[PDB]
């Protein structure tokens, strides 16, 4: 125990610092908006975990204070506990949030694509005080989106994260915990086979379709002639529902960001611990 090995400690600590910094760069730069991006993020966390596994085996020494920092933050042996703890947070918390954003991203794009058609569904009325709305084309497109995202598959499931040809499901209790965590309405909790899933919120779309039927029966052309005031009042209601979906997506992306920030704060604790150890290896008390 009397012979030092600063050279090898410097190499081992440097190696770990580098891998941790690379994983951090990935997790701060790569948005969780596609399967491909999330694969990159998951790989970055694997690279971090592996680096801590290697560091644990390297025999670098921790001071009492560094030891304590690690125990406190993550509540050879110490590094294995740290690796286990951060791995759980990455897989079970951050990785679920990443799936939530990617799934919602594509859903919301599908909605955006319908909004892009609305211009063509609003025509001149019989005179300057009236309009003609293609209520049939609009309702059909919304109902189609509802139908698509009312299914249970990888396009629709927020939790659990999906992969392979089955449907991964959770216990009701675990699913409700995520429902609460995500601040989603109760309609998002769905039974599937032996368990439960959490899916996208269709309620504003369904409300839109209801308000369309509320305007009254279309004419012979499947379109609805409307006085300007009535159209304006309907448009206000439609926008309100668009706002609801926008708000939902916003909550979810902010919560993802905070999950990513929580993981990053742990990474900072790692980097600071390793940096302090590197100073120790380089320092000579006179
Ligand atoms: Ni010795």
UniProtKB/Swiss-Prot annotation:
It is found in: Secreted. Gene3D superfamilies: IpaD-like. Induction: Transcriptionally regulated by SicA and InvF. Also regulated by InvE. Residues 239-266 form a coiled coil. Its main location: secreted. Keywords: Coiled coil, Secreted, Virulence. The keyword Secreted applies. The N-terminal domain is an intra-molecular chaperone that prevents premature oligomerization of the residues on the coiled-coil region that are involved in interactions with the needle and/or itself. The residues in the C-terminal domain probably form oligomeric structures at the tip of the needle that are responsible for the regulation of secretion of other effectors. Required for translocation of effector proteins via the type III secretion system SPI-1, which is essential for an efficient bacterial internalization. Probably acts by modulating the secretion of SipA, SipB, and SipC. Belongs to the invasin protein D family. This is Cell invasion protein SipD. It comes from Salmonella typhimurium (strain LT2 / SGSC1412 / ATCC 700720).
């Amino acid at each position: 125990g009397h012979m030092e090995h600063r050279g090898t400690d410097i190499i081992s600590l440097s190696q770990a610092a580098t891998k941790i910094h690379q994983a951090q760069q990935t997790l701060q730069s790569t948005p969780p908006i596609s399967e491909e991006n999330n694969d990159e993020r998951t790989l970055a966390r694997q690279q971090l975990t592996s680096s801590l596994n290697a560091l644990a085996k390297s025999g670098v020494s921790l001071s009492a204070e560094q030891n304590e920092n690690l125990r406190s933050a993550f509540s050879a042996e110490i590094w294995d506990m740290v690796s286990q703890n951060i791995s759980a947070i990455g897989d079970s918390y951050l990785g679920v949030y990443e799936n939530v954003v990617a799934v919602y991203t594509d859903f919301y794009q599908a909605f955006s694509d319908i909004l892009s058609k609305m211009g063509g569904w609003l025509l001149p009325g019989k005179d300057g005080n009236t309009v003609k709305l293609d209520v049939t084309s609009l309702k059909n497109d919304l109902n189609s989106l509802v139908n698509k995202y009312n299914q249970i598959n990888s396009n629709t499931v927020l939790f659990p994260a999906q992969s392979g040809s089955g449907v991964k499901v959770a216990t009701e209790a675990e699913a409700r915990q995520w429902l609460s965590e995500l601040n989603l309405p109760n309609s998002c909790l769905k039974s599937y086979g032996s368990g439960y899933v959490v899916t996208v919120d269709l309620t504003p779309l369904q409300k839109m379709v209801q308000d369309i039927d509320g305007l009254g029966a279309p004419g012979k052309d499947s379109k609805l002639e409307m006085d300007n005031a009535k159209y304006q009042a309907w448009q206000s209601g439609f926008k309100a529902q668009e706002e609801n979906m926008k708000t939902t997506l916003q909550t979810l992306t902010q919560k993802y960001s905070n999950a990513n920030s929580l993981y990053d704060n742990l990474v900072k604790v790692l980097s600071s611990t390793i940096s302090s150890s590197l100073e120790t290896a380089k320092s000579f008390l006179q």
